[PDB]
Design a protein around this nucleic acid. Structure first.
Ligand SMILES: [Cu+]
Ligand SMILES: [K+]
Ligand SMILES: [K+]
Ligand SMILES: [K+]
Ligand SMILES: [K+]
Ligand SMILES: [K+]
Ligand SMILES: [K+]
Ligand SMILES: [K+]
Ligand SMILES: [K+]
Ligand SMILES: [K+]
Ligand SMILES: [K+]
Ligand SMILES: [K+]
Ligand SMILES: [K+]
Ligand SMILES: [K+]
Ligand SMILES: [K+]
Ligand SMILES: [K+]
Ligand SMILES: [K+]
Ligand SMILES: [K+]
Ligand SMILES: [K+]
Ligand SMILES: [K+]
Ligand SMILES: [K+]
Ligand SMILES: [K+]
Ligand SMILES: [K+]
Ligand SMILES: [K+]
Ligand SMILES: [K+]
Ligand SMILES: [K+]
Ligand SMILES: [K+]
Ligand SMILES: [K+]
Ligand SMILES: [K+]
Ligand SMILES: [K+]
Ligand SMILES: [K+]
Ligand SMILES: [K+]
Ligand SMILES: [K+]
Ligand SMILES: [K+]
Ligand SMILES: [K+]
Ligand SMILES: [K+]
Ligand SMILES: [K+]
Ligand SMILES: [K+]
Ligand SMILES: [K+]
Ligand SMILES: [K+]
Ligand SMILES: [K+]
Ligand SMILES: [K+]
Ligand SMILES: [Mg+2]
Ligand SMILES: [Mg+2]
Ligand SMILES: [Mg+2]
Ligand SMILES: [Mg+2]
Ligand SMILES: [Mg+2]
Ligand SMILES: [Mg+2]
Ligand SMILES: [Mg+2]
Ligand SMILES: [Mg+2]
Ligand SMILES: [Mg+2]
Ligand SMILES: [Mg+2]
Ligand SMILES: [Mg+2]
Ligand SMILES: [Mg+2]
Ligand SMILES: [Mg+2]
Ligand SMILES: [Mg+2]
Ligand SMILES: [Mg+2]
Ligand SMILES: [Mg+2]
Ligand SMILES: [Mg+2]
Ligand SMILES: [Mg+2]
Ligand SMILES: [Mg+2]
Ligand SMILES: [Mg+2]
Ligand SMILES: [Mg+2]
Ligand SMILES: [Mg+2]
Ligand SMILES: [Mg+2]
Ligand SMILES: [Mg+2]
Ligand SMILES: [Mg+2]
Ligand SMILES: [Mg+2]
Ligand SMILES: [Mg+2]
Ligand SMILES: [Mg+2]
Ligand SMILES: [Mg+2]
Ligand SMILES: [Mg+2]
Ligand SMILES: [Mg+2]
Ligand SMILES: [Mg+2]
Ligand SMILES: [Mg+2]
Ligand SMILES: [Mg+2]
Ligand SMILES: [Mg+2]
Ligand SMILES: [Mg+2]
Ligand SMILES: [Mg+2]
Ligand SMILES: [Mg+2]
Ligand SMILES: [Mg+2]
Ligand SMILES: [Mg+2]
Ligand SMILES: [Mg+2]
Ligand SMILES: [Mg+2]
Ligand SMILES: [Mg+2]
Ligand SMILES: [Mg+2]
Ligand SMILES: [Mg+2]
Ligand SMILES: [Mg+2]
Ligand SMILES: [Mg+2]
Ligand SMILES: [Mg+2]
Ligand SMILES: [Mg+2]
Ligand SMILES: [Mg+2]
Ligand SMILES: [Mg+2]
Ligand SMILES: [Mg+2]
Ligand SMILES: [Mg+2]
Ligand SMILES: [Mg+2]
Lengths: 123, 129
RNA sequence: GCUAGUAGGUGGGGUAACGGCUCACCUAGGCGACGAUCCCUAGCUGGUCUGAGAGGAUGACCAGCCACACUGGAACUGAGACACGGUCCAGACUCCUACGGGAGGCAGCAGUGGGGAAUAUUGCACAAUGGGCGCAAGCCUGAUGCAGCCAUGCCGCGUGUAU
RNA sequence: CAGAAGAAGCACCGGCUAACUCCGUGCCAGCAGCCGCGGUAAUACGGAGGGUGCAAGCGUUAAUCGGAAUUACUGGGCGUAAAGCGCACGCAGGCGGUUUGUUAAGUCAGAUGUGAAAUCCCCGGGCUCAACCUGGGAACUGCAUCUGAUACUGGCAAGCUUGAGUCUCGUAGAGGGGGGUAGAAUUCCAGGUGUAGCGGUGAAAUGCGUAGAGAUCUGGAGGAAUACCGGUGGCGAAGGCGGCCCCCUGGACGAAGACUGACGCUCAGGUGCGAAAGCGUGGGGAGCAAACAGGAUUAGAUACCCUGGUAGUCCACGCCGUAAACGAUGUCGACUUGGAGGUUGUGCCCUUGAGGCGUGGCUUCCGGAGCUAACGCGUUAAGUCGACCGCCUGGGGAGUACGGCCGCA
RNA sequence: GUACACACCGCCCGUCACACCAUGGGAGUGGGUUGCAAAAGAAGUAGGUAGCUUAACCUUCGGGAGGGCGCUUACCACUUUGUGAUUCAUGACUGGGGUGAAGUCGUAACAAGGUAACCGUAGGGGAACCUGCGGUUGGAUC
RNA sequence: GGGAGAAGGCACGCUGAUAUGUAGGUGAGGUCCCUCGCGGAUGGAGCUGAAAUCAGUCGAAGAUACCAGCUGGCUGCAACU
């Protein structure tokens, strides 16, 4: 583009949309689980991944992953969610925070405990 | 149409050097002559002469050192679509001072070093290296 | 496409002051693709973060400027206000009442409930700096100086040394 | 004073990325920023041992800039990757050959005022150090005013001819608009001769024919298109333009001059032209032929093939405004090795003709340097530069929806 | 020549059936904001003034001037009415789109893809598509 | 072209002033000219006369009587008179 053309119409920056709109630029958001269930991943993976449909304090209704082996979540559980997509799960853009609010930690976890809300064992 | 005789002069020099021409010829002007004087003084060209009265013609004798053109690169800086003026403290350095910038100052057309010595800014006509 | 006090002029009025600030009359003008009008968002700056730079993003703390003070409107007093802890009217809420009628405004400091992923003590003192009044002494000052809580950040140190 | 006495955790270890083995599991449980990992010998899941990185912190999430030259002013692109408007004329706007004088607006130099303090930076000072506090400077890249410089750009005045244009003579051309006419051929009509097939296909059938077809001869009607010439030939802004004749009319080119004196280039918006199909009104209709019908083929055959056939193709006027409207290449100007051709001018010379030597315009193929991801382009550039405009910013959704404008649709 | 590379036993298109998701239309209907035309008129300020009432000044001692209250007019907040605009939500039904999954129907494209492909347009068809007219080569063979 | 008088709304009597009656209309005498008449020009007396604005004023009510559109939304059918 010539300088005259840029004087007439300047260069325009492309606006980037967030991949986590339901957080509304907050580090976490609290929600109430409306459904807790399992779902199968996209090919080439196969599993029964644990997810929950949750309604947030801002009215957004989203799907959140429940990481770790085993969980204590059911309908009406109050949980905290954070950003983070699950690649093989269609439309799962958030992760449940283990060890916050009604979500317990993972039993018998010894490594990466802080990522799953597990206290230090008394050994 | 023709709208930048100075860029035309520079391009004639560039293309003649690329084509290994002994000399290049063009219609003359006082500004072209001043630029030719700077080029000759800095040793980028061998000589120049103006011939004719009503339609003056400027001829520049190009030089080659070891089978290679002396003018390695010549580039218009200020142009009709975008004029470039620099103050004395912001005069450009060409090839870390190994080349020259032709500058039009109120004391005439000279190199960037000469303009710095005179303490003048001006219009940056071209870079030569 | 927008504009009839609209643009300008004359005269009267008005203000501390110039001015369509206001009124009467006259002219038919004025703004706009160098984006008027309308719609959405937004306190502005010194600065801050990032970047080699040019830029991009941003405006918490500190300082300058502006605006607001439950919501809407108004003036009074005064050098100065259309006035956070003044006045009057209206409105929504809360409260008192003998049912006629009355009272109130933490976006001051601390604190409570609520919302939220999340942000502290209903502390000490005017000793210092500054402010109000006073001849002064002095009184007042949640400004301020300090103290309490929090790994929130930056910086320093330790959790031993040698064998 | 006492006694090591009261004081270490968090993430990671397949690649990016520093750090590897065993066991458990067996596309399960699970991991994941991406590439991906998990299927019975998993350095990728989970535990352990060992190791790596940070450390009173360590990880995760959110958010900004960076990397991203991935909006490119510095600092990108558009033949085929996304991208040149279908083609033009042209207002505003941007840009402007050459000489002299003048002006000093841009530009440049100096000075003055201001650019709060704090913050950033430099040299120092004080807290045991550091963070922190602090003295002075630098900086605040800006604005205004004054005084100077005049090369370049702008303004003003006067010129100049090389850009651009006018005149004179001639040349080629399917350039355009209007009218007339000619010959070939198809179809239809009438008549003569004549008799059993014709037509069609891969083979058939539908169809036509003893009510006399097909074939052959003669006469007539009518519409549409112009064989040969004809050519990587010509003309035109593009779309496009093809028998012959007349009338009206546009552009290009060449040779000598004469004339004007920068009158120029580009162009958002605007306006005009714009194949075929399609639309409206009125005509026309031979041949062809969407739709449609029948016959075939086939598993089917809403096709390809066959027999028919209506809009339409044609004319007048109006609308539509799109095409792989393509060189998938915007316009204008300058510059940079060569070869072989086509076409159309013109100068000179000779022994005078398929003659020789030049010099212009347009055009086809090859190829050098250079350029390009490559393919290729290559003086008609996609090379080297300048002026102006149009356009692109991952694939799909989508040139779609909604709104506006235009249109009879 | 190629759109094939576990390499034509390749690749691959669309309707239809199933699942999920966002979105256009939709009898309309509910909110938010706002334009225009009016109605309204608390308090305040300003102008006027029947009526009532007055500490300072002047009186010829009766009053006068001036002031205040009340009343009235102008401006205007709340509020009300009518009709538009815009925006958000929602709506039986309906349009196409994306994703997944592969079930039914075919085989349009890639080789000359078995009728070269594609562009504009028009008509037709369950579907990919077919046909006419002009155009392109980004067509194989010759 | 319409829809449209869409819808909805404001003003309206009388008195005085502007102005002893205004803008406008009409137009005599007088004066000048003339190709002298049922003429032209000027001139304005007299007559007639809206509408508006400002101020005031009466009533419950000023288009006061008679007279004199109800309006809007969805839809079937027929183009229309
Ligand atoms: Cu009481
Ligand atoms: K897998
Ligand atoms: K005004
Ligand atoms: K005035
Ligand atoms: K005035
Ligand atoms: K910066
Ligand atoms: K800034
Ligand atoms: K307020
Ligand atoms: K205050
Ligand atoms: K004090
Ligand atoms: K095993
Ligand atoms: K650039
Ligand atoms: K100057
Ligand atoms: K000058
Ligand atoms: K001609
Ligand atoms: K003819
Ligand atoms: K122009
Ligand atoms: K017709
Ligand atoms: K026909
Ligand atoms: K046919
Ligand atoms: K015609
Ligand atoms: K069309
Ligand atoms: K072509
Ligand atoms: K030639
Ligand atoms: K020749
Ligand atoms: K049109
Ligand atoms: K039609
Ligand atoms: K190949
Ligand atoms: K299918
Ligand atoms: K829908
Ligand atoms: K009063
Ligand atoms: K609405
Ligand atoms: K709706
Ligand atoms: K096909
Ligand atoms: K093909
Ligand atoms: K077609
Ligand atoms: K069907
Ligand atoms: K009245
Ligand atoms: K009169
Ligand atoms: K009168
Ligand atoms: K009526
Ligand atoms: K009908
Ligand atoms: Mg003013
Ligand atoms: Mg705000
Ligand atoms: Mg950078
Ligand atoms: Mg602030
Ligand atoms: Mg409040
Ligand atoms: Mg006062
Ligand atoms: Mg105030
Ligand atoms: Mg106060
Ligand atoms: Mg208060
Ligand atoms: Mg508080
Ligand atoms: Mg809470
Ligand atoms: Mg490594
Ligand atoms: Mg194993
Ligand atoms: Mg592991
Ligand atoms: Mg960048
Ligand atoms: Mg690029
Ligand atoms: Mg392509
Ligand atoms: Mg392309
Ligand atoms: Mg083109
Ligand atoms: Mg042009
Ligand atoms: Mg010039
Ligand atoms: Mg400063
Ligand atoms: Mg200084
Ligand atoms: Mg000049
Ligand atoms: Mg006929
Ligand atoms: Mg001619
Ligand atoms: Mg244009
Ligand atoms: Mg046609
Ligand atoms: Mg039709
Ligand atoms: Mg027709
Ligand atoms: Mg026919
Ligand atoms: Mg046929
Ligand atoms: Mg197009
Ligand atoms: Mg074409
Ligand atoms: Mg194109
Ligand atoms: Mg041509
Ligand atoms: Mg080539
Ligand atoms: Mg290229
Ligand atoms: Mg469209
Ligand atoms: Mg196959
Ligand atoms: Mg909807
Ligand atoms: Mg009112
Ligand atoms: Mg009142
Ligand atoms: Mg296709
Ligand atoms: Mg096929
Ligand atoms: Mg076939
Ligand atoms: Mg085919
Ligand atoms: Mg299209
Ligand atoms: Mg068909
Ligand atoms: Mg109606
Ligand atoms: Mg009369
Ligand atoms: Mg009656
Ligand atoms: Mg019915
Ligand atoms: Mg009827």
């Amino acid at each position: 583009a010539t300088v005259n053309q840029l004087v007439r119409k300047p260069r325009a920056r492309k606006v980037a949309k967030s991949n986590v709109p339901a957080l509304e630029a907050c580090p976490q958001k609290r929600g109430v689980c409306t459904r807790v269930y399992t779902t199968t991943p996209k090919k080439p993976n196969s599993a029964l991944r644990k997810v929950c449909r949750v309604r947030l304090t801002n009215g957004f209704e989203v799907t959140s992953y429940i990481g770790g082996e085993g969980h204590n979540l059911q309908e009406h559980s109050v949980i905290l969610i954070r950003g983070g997509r699950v690649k093989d799960l269609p439309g799962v853009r958030y992760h449940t925070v283990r060890g916050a609010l009604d979500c317990s930690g993972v039993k018998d976890r010894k490594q990466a405990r802080s990522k799953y809300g597990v206290k230090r064992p008394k050994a | 149409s023709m709208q930048d005789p100075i860029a035309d002069m520079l391009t004639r020099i560039r293309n003649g050097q690329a084509a290994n021409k002994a000399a290049v010829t063009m219609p003359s002007s006082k500004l072209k002559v001043a630029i030719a004087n700077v080029l000759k003084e800095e040793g980028f060209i061998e000589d120049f002469k103006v011939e004719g009265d009503t339609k003056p013609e400027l001829e520049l004798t190009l030089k080659y050192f070891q089978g290679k053109a002396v003018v390695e690169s010549i580039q218009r800086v200020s142009r009709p679509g975008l004029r470039i003026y620099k103050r004395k403290d912001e005069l450009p350095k060409v090839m870390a001072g190994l080349g020259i910038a032709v500058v039009s100052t109120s004391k005439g057309v000279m190199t960037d070093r000469a303009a710095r010595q005179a303490g003048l800014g001006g219009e940056i006509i071209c870079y030569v290296a």
